[PDB]
Design a protein around this ligand. Structure first.
Ligand SMILES: Nc1ncnc2c1ncn2[C@@H]1O[C@H](COP(=O)(O)O[C@H]2[C@@H](O)[C@H](n3cnc4c(N)ncnc43)O[C@@H]2COP(=O)(O)OP(=O)(O)OP(=O)(O)O)[C@@H](O)[C@H]1O
Ligand SMILES: Nc1ncnc2c1ncn2[C@@H]1O[C@H](COP(=O)(O)OP(=O)(O)OP(=O)(O)O)[C@@H](O)[C@H]1O
Ligand SMILES: [Mg+2]
Ligand SMILES: [Mg+2]
Ligand SMILES: [Mg+2]
Lengths: 751, 297, 207
């Protein structure tokens, strides 16, 4: 039995669900999906049919006599069971003509269950549209048959130009991610629906693939007896899977610690290079293990999670892979960048939460990751590091390294390759990984950012080229691997970018938004009762898609002067117009609140910099402002910090996002509306107020004197309503008034 | 034992790789470089190298002190015995320096995580925008990363068996500054050898886990012994050789990778003074001997 | 072997050194002065004094006719002629706060200036934060006795540089009236070692 057939039958497993909810007869959905696949002439090997029509307990009981051993459809069943987690194991199938199945429900956001111990219980949903991202909605939404038929028509269009082959499994995942991302895995009430069909099918395929590899390595050809003839409790207790912990270390130091004259143009290139490194390493490992991309759980933030098979051959491949990757990274990034690979022996009960400590997988994974991150190198790599040391005269301008130095310039191979790519990084661009390229990649490859037009003439039947694209259309033909990241570049020069404002300031504003307690939201935020591999994967992919895709779409919605450097996961870096940073901070907070249903806190930090300020210093200052926002507490009595704050140009100026920021923005809008049109001569009192309120712990005489002067000022004007509202807001809100006034001044300064 | 307290009268630049940023402490190789430069100044570099290479003067690096609270970089414990309670997460990640008397309390748990960081406040990093004025060309704006300490705050160096020659060198190092832009208005301090009593007990103690207190590189013989159940971290110690009598131009030195001053080991190793400048006409040395603080988990 | 050169800098016409870009308003101080990072007291950075004194000496000892004197006194690293230093300048903190507080007056002033267009005859009011006149800056300069023969020439050049600074400015818009200074209490006392000719070095600065 071929593995590709198993992967295809585990992926295209619940197509019958959509074909049943859409149109046609109302029979059991497995038969409908099997017929739908059989209608195509290329998915004809009867193994796809066995996996699709027979992946539930009742079907297996109904055909176990006809189908002989090693029939390949026990693996998909025992994989769907693990993917479901706490969900049904033996129950009536969808559309069994025995229950009025609620064939109109949409999948809710997994933020309904998130932090239900202290943030309540709700049931939201994703409305159907036509990308773009669907925010959770308070109103109850129902999916229409027309949406189902559109999905069916697009699926029939795509699957016609598809094959059950290794190179087309990626296109199958792309089609599933595009279409099924917003349709539920199950359609009923009194249970949970938030598990998407894309996540469910991808997890099922990954589990089935790992189980097949483990069975093949252990030389087992008794799938029925091991899995279905009994409760499979023996297989459940024993360990069969692994979970890798690819963790790239020192990304911040590799990216931000630079000192070039054109360094601002390079941070996007550095972040893109690191994301490409991580994704290419994950894909190459998956190829080495003869595994599809369904086995990848999460990629982003220099962190990859893969679900492997616990076989001695797999562990040997992992050891050799780690040796090769460590040697390559040592060759390129001596210690300035390093990836730690650690895997934990995980059984089926651990993922399916039978023991009640599913989180122990990640506990021991983090323990092994930290252990390898401490004793990183053996006492031969250190000898090589200290012996490959040479006294030099020249060094890299940014990377400040004397090896890998280009002959004609004081710039390092990395240090000019990720300037050529930054020059060549535009929109409607794809990314290729061929033996000839511009950016170095491990395992003797290189990557380029060539346009889609040159892609056709680039392949020329070159076996593997690893085409990477930001956008995917016509999924079936022109196989490509879709990669997402922050790629909103209104203008990539940062000087004409800044000199587009007419009234404002000549400062460079930046944003560093970090989600608060996301690690805790993973450790204990998700309920223990609702703990599953599919649900965790759904939450992870929802957060990653939110960040990358929706940051891109939100910036592309209308004209924003932002040149986003990094989105990835749990983090955010932005450089653009100062007022654009300020007015997009509120957009970011409101969009995060809407998408996460006010369950996860976020913190930011904004800094003003000149046109030639050190970008490493920019990043370090914005990071320590971000920390000053992270350590915010209204009162010094409760344990731990609220973390829900924003620092506005100063570490000491820790404001909030709550009613406090509401007040500061209401004040800013009121001041902007009122103080545009003065007598244009009495406005000189504004700097008087600013410099006499800069700090009030000293001679108070001048403050009450200015109060008396404001009272004294008497002519025909707006009156003294707002002229005394200034006094009213001048006592209760001191720091608030100075902050709002300085924001107003910077916005309205004739500079 | 012999806490050398350094009181700075001007902001310091203790740069790590570039001039635009400064770090708050200097390492032991920086201090040995400064003292070797002084010894070359008064003509006894050979005796100083003999003393330091015969372990007669071995020192840790510079740690912060605040109001007679001697601080130490967060030791790299395996944290295998704390997952039961407290916060085995990023709470103990922003914490950079812990006090050295409260280490056994921290090691066994019970030290506040949030409280320390605001308690740990010694000055702040500063920008220093400078230029190279050119009469007719354009001026060259550059900035120097600096750091100013508080009034009752500075750095302290652990030295075992202080030496008359070392005392003579530290007098000369007052007036030549320490750090990056010392000939500019930045490096400046006064020191006190300041024998201490509650500290020598910590280094007269015993225990299974050893805390490396100086950026050290093991000898080729004991690297295998030291790299067993160790939680360490490497760091490149390179840059440019600071001497006007070396290689007749501005040449870099062989980058050396050493264990950081917060690493923890089960096997005590004695590091080495490393020849990192060979092609020049004087031996450029990297002080990488080992200075430990044994604890028991 | 180490000499420390004490003395005081007295501001005569108000001085504006340095630019720290932060906290600007519509009126504002359009250009602030350098201050201590913690105490916020104004200071003369050792780099500013060193550079202006080196400028005056280099343009004096040469006159369009660096030299050995300037390179040996301030250092050099250009391409081959690497000379280390003999002078070690320090940041100079504002000494006069006890005296300046008796006048109930701040250590800094905001000077109001404008430029008038010559075509449209339209003014433009700029504000320049300035350290007030009469402020004193006691300093210290460390000199390393690398060579015992050249000490007299080096200290003659140091006194000459101080004298040139007396008839010049130190920071900011000097030709527009700012930044005049003076020196007094100029003494050199050996700090480490023993120089028997410290009397003639004090007489060099005393002159
Ligand atoms: N599924 C899963 N993924 C990741 N970690 C998981 C999971 N289950 C359990 N755990 C445990 O959580 C912590 C995570 O710590 P860490 O390894 O430092 O990893 C980073 C990052 O890789 C990861 N991350 C970022 N973005 C995502 C997304 N979209 N999906 C999954 N994982 C993601 O979380 C960590 C980010 O660290 P911080 O940003 O510093 O955390 P914080 O919220 O900002 O804290 P604070 O500063 O606000 O206080 C491990 O123990 C792991 O076993
Ligand atoms: N390509 C990238 N560009 C920008 N930021 C990234 C990129 N990849 C990852 N990051 C983020 O930078 C954060 C810090 O990563 P980094 O490895 O430098 O520190 P760390 O998490 O403490 O790990 P370690 O202690 O091993 O160095 C990460 O959490 C990640 O989200
Ligand atoms: Mg990491
Ligand atoms: Mg986070
Ligand atoms: Mg993060």
């Amino acid at each position: 039995m071929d593995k590709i057939n198993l992967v295809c039958g585990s992926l295209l497993a619940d197509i019958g669900k959509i074909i049943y909810r859409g149109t046609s007869e109302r029979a059991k959905h497995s038969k409908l999906g099997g017929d739908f696949i059989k209608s195509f002439e290329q998915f004809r090997n009867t193994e796809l049919t066995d996996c699709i029509r027979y992946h539930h307990a009742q079907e297996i009981t109904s055909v176990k006599s006809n189908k002989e051993k090693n029939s390949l459809f026990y693996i998909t069943y025992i994989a769907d069971n693990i993917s479901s987690g706490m969900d049904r194991r033996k129950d009536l199938e969808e559309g069994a003509e025995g229950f009025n199945w609620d064939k109109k429900v949409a999948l809710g956001s997994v933020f309904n269950v998130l932090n239900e111990k202290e943030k309540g219980r709700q049931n939201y949903s994703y409305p159907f549209v036509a990308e773009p991202l669907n925010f959770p909605t308070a109103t109850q939404n129902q999916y229409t048959t027309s949406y189902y038929d559109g999905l069916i028509t697009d699926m029939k269009t795509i699957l016609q130009r598809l094959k059950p082959d290794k190179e087309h499994i990626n296109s199958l995942l792309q089609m599933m991610e595009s279409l099924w991302s917003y349709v539920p895995s199950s359609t009923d009430k009194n249970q949970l629906v938030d598990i998407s069909l894309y996540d469910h099918s991808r997890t099922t395929a990954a589990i089935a693939s790992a189980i097949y590899d483990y069975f093949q390595a252990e030389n087992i050809t008794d799938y029925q007896k091991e899995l279905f003839d009994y409760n499979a409790t023996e297989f459940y207790d024993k360990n069969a899977f692994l979970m890798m912990n690819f963790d790239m270390s020192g990304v911040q130091n590799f990216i931000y610690n630079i000192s070039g004259s054109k360094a601002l143009k390079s941070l996007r290139a550095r972040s893109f290079y690191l994301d490409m490194l991580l994704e290419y390493i994950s894909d190459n490992l998956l190829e080495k293990l003869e595994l599809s991309r369904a086995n990848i759980l999460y990629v982003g933030g220099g962190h990859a999670y893969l679900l492997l098979a616990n076989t001695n051959k797999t562990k040997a491949i992992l050891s050799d892979f780690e040796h090769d990757l460590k040697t390559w990274f040592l060759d390129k990034f001596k210690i300035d960048l390093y990836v730690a690979m650690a895997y934990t022996e995980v059984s089926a009960n651990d993922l399916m939460n039978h023991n009640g400590h599913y989180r122990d997988i990640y506990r021991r994974l983090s323990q092994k990751t930290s252990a390898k991150k401490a004793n990183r190198y053996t006492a031969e790599e250190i000898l090589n590091l200290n012996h490959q040391g040479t006294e030099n005269a020249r060094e890299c301008r940014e990377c400040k390294r004397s090896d890998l130095l280009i002959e004609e310039d004081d710039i390092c191979e990395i240090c000019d390759s990720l300037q050529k790519v930054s020059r060549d990084l535009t929109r409607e661009n794809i990314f290729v990984i061929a033996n000839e390229g511009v950016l170095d990649m491990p395992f003797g490859k290189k990557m380029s950012a060539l346009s889609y037009s040159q892609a056709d003439k680039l392949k020329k039947s070159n076996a593997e080229v690893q085409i990477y694209a930001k956008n995917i259309s016509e999924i079936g033909q022109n196989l490509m691997t879709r990669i997402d990241m922050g790629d909103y570049t209104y203008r990539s020069d940062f000087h004409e970018m800044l000199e587009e404002v007419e009234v404002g300031i000549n400062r460079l504003g930046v944003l560093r938004a970090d989600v608060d307690n996301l690690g805790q939201a993973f450790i204990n935020g998700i309920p223990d009762d609702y703990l599953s591999i599919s649900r965790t994967a759904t939450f992870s992919r929802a957060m990653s898609r939110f960040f990358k895709n929706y940051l891109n779409q939100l910036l592309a919605e209308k004209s924003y002067k932002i040149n986003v450097i990094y989105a990835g996961g749990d983090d955010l870096f932005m450089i653009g117009a100062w007022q654009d940073i300020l007015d997009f901070s509120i957009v970011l907070k409101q969009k995060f609140a809407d998408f996460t249903q006010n369950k996860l806190s976020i913190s930011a930090g904004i800094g003003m910099f000149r046109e030639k300020y050190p970008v490493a210093r920019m990043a370090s200052l914005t990071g320590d402002l971000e920390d000053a926002a992270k350590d915010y507490k209204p009162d010094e009595r409760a344990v731990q910090a609220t973390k829900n704050a924003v620092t506005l140009f100063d570490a000491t100026n820790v404001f909030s996002w709550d009613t406090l920021e509401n007040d500061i923005f209401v004040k800013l809008d009121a001041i902007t509306k009122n103080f545009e049109k003065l007598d244009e001569t009495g406005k000189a009192f504004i700097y008087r107020l600013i410099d006499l309120l800069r700090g009030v712990n000293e001679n108070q005489q001048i403050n009450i004197a200015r109060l008396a002067y404001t009272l004294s000022r008497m002519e025909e004007k707006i009156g003294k309503t707002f002229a005394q509202e200034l006094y009213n807001w001048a006592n209760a809100d001191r720091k608030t008034l100075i902050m709002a006034l300085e924001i107003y001044i910077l916005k309205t300064r004739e500079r | 034992m012999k806490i050398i307290k350094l009181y700075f009268e001007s902001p310091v630049h203790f740069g790590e790789k570039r001039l635009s940023e400064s770090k708050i402490t200097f390492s032991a190789d920086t201090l040995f470089s400064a003292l070797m430069i002084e010894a070359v100044g008064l003509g006894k570099e050979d005796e100083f190298y003999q003393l330091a290479s015969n372990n007669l003067v071995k020192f840790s690096d510079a740690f912060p002190f605040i109001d007679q609270y001697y601080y130490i970089p967060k030791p790299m414990f395996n944290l295998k015995l704390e997952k039961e309670d407290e916060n085995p997460s990023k709470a103990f990640k922003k914490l950079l320096y812990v006090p050295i008397d409260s280490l056994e309390d921290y090691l066994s748990g019970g030290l506040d995580a949030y409280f320390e960081r605001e308690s740990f406040n010694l000055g702040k990093l500063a920008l220093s925008e400078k230029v190279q004025q050119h009469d007719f060309k354009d001026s060259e704006p550059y900035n120097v990363g600096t750091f100013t300490f508080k009034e009752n705050t500075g750095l302290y160096v652990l030295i075992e068996q202080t030496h008359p020659l070392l005392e003579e060198l530290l007098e000369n190092l007052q007036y030549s500054g320490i750090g990056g832009k010392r000939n500019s208005g930045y490096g400046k301090f006064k020191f006190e050898i300041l024998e201490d009593s509650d500290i020598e007990d910590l280094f007269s103690a015993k225990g299974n886990r050893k805390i490396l207190l100086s950026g050290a590189l093991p000898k080729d013989a004991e690297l295998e012994q030291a790299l067993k159940n160790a939680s360490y971290l490497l760091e490149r110690r390179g840059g440019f050789v600071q001497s006007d009598t070396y290689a007749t131009n501005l040449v870099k030195k062989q980058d050396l990778y050493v264990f950081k001053s917060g690493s923890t080991f089960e096997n005590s190793f004695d590091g080495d003074i490393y020849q990192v400048g060979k092609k020049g006409n004087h031996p450029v040395y990297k002080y990488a001997k080992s200075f430990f603080l044994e604890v028991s988990v | 072997m180490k000499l420390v050169i004490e003395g005081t800098i007295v501001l005569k016409t108000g001085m504006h050194i340095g630019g720290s870009s932060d906290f600007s308003a519509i009126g504002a101080v359009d250009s602030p002065v350098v201050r201590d990072t913690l105490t916020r007291l104004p200071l003369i950075p050792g780099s500013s004094l060193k550079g202006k004194m080196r400028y005056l000496l280099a343009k004096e000892l040469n006159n369009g006719i660096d030299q050995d004197e300037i390179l040996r006194l301030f250092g050099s690293s250009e391409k081959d002629k690497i000379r280390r230093a003999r002078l070690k300048f320090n940041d100079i903190k504002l000494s006069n706060l006890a005296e300046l507080e008796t006048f109930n007056v701040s250590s800094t002033e905001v000077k109001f200036e404008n430029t008038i267009n010559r075509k449209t005859a339209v003014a433009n009011p700029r504000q320049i934060e300035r350290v007030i006149a009469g402020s004193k800056f006691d300093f210290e300069i460390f000199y390393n006795l690398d060579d015992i023969k050249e000490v007299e020439k080096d200290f003659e050049n140091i006194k000459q540089g101080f004298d040139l600074l007396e008839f010049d400015y130190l920071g900011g818009h000097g030709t527009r009236g700012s930044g005049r200074i003076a020196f007094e209490n100029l003494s050199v006392i050996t700090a480490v070692g023993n120089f028997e000719k410290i009397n003639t070095l004090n007489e060099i600065l005393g002159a």
